[PDB]
């Protein structure tokens, strides 16, 4: 069964774009999020994510704008990734539907 995941204290360490296989109207924007404090070989340090950006609409989606911001500043963010899977370098990546920056250790365990 697929179920929606909620991850706390994740920092985006990579950004990527690639065409969408099913339809050429959309294109996927991917990334890699690493959990703070996770072991180097733990799966939590290599979590891949992607989301679809519509190409009929020129400009930038809201998700891209803040993703570019946190990637540059390396800020933590709570990531509501799930449940669908999108291909990313031939490897599964959880689709991201909502992502919010952290406010402190009180709300980000």
């Amino acid at each position, epitope marked *: *069964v*697929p*179920y929606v*995941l909620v991850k706390t204290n994740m920092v985006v360490t990579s950004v990527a774009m690639k065409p969408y296989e099913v339809t050429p109207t959309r294109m996927l924007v991917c990334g890699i999020a690493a959990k703070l404090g996770a*072991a*180097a*070989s*733990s*799966p939590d340090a*290599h*979590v891949p994510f992607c989301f679809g950006k519509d190409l009929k609409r020129p400009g930038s989606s809201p998700m891209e704008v803040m993703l570019r911001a946190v990637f540059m500043q390396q800020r933590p963010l709570r990531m509501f990734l*799930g*449940p*669908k*899977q999108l*291909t990313f370098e*031939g*490897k*599964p*990546a*959880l689709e991201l539907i909502r992502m919010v920056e952290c406010s402190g250790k009180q709300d980000c365990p």
Partner: antibody, heavy 127, light 107 residues
Framework: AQLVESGGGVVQPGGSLRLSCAAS????????LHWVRQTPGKGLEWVAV????????YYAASVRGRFTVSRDNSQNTLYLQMSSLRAEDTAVYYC???????????????????????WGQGTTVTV | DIVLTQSPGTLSLSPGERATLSCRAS???????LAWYQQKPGQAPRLLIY???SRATGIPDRFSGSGSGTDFTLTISSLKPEDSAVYFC?????????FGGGTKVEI
């Protein structure tokens, strides 16, 4: 749980092939399916995976573009469409059913892993 | 891109001795993403022990797993004559389903 692995592999390198998996007792509509090749030299290697409804379909690095997977849950079958095969495609192709993951991957979700447990007799493909 | 190496090349043990089969991983995978197979010569592999601390269905109790880390072992208590096969360890903690080399145990 029986799988027949119909079809046979003798095809010149520029040709195409289309294998079939056919279950016998277990219904195919609610289980993930894998294809695994067994090279006598390089050992067992993973080919492709497919989800229950067909949403997620991931292949291997070497067969990323040439191979294709598909299902027909009405007729209880699983197919693998094969494009131009090089010399490295010569292996014995099996059918594997991951028990408790109707999606392709369970390691992403942090779910526990149950490994396959259903395999077919195998079909031999040579180029 | 994780390579599993089985350092036992080939064993020939007595029908009552204990066999230990080491599976070394490139990275420190978790224990819940492991499995062990058995391939008798002439048929497709069957799962022996998935999630090494747990067994599969229709298998004797002589098979046991090991702990997590980078090294894992499969223990067979009493090598009955029927246990002459090639044994593998697979992985699923990353996207490519990578299998082991294959340790052949013959009696």
């Amino acid at each position: 749980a029986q799988l027949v692995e119909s079809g046979g592999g003798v095809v010149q390198p520029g040709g195409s092939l289309r294998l079939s998996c056919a279950a016998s007792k277990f219904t195919i509509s609610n289980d993930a399916l894998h294809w695994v090749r067994q090279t006598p030299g390089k050992g067992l290697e993973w080919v492709a995976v497919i989800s229950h409804d067909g949403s997620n379909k991931y292949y291997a690095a070497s067969v990323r573009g040439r191979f294709t997977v598909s299902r027909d849950n009405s007729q209880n079958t699983l197919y693998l469409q094969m494009s131009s095969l090089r010399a490295e495609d010569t292996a014995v192709y099996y059918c594997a059913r991951e028990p408790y993951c109707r999606s392709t991957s369970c390691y992403l979700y942090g779910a526990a892993y149950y490994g396959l447990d259903v395999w077919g007799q195998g079909t031999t493909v040579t180029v | 891109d994780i390579v599993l190496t089985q350092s036992p090349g080939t064993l020939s043990l007595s029908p009552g001795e204990r066999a230990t089969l080491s599976c070394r991983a490139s990275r420190s995978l978790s224990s819940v993403y492991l499995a062990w197979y058995q391939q008798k010569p002439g048929q497709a592999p069957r799962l022996l022990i998935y999630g090494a601390s747990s067994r599969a269905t229709g298998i004797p109790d002589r098979f046991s797993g090991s702990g997590s880390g980078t090294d894992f072992t499969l223990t067979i208590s009493s090598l009955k004559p029927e246990d002459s096969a090639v044994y593998f360890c697979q992985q699923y903690a990353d996207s490519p389903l990578t299998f082991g080399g294959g340790t052949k145990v013959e009696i």
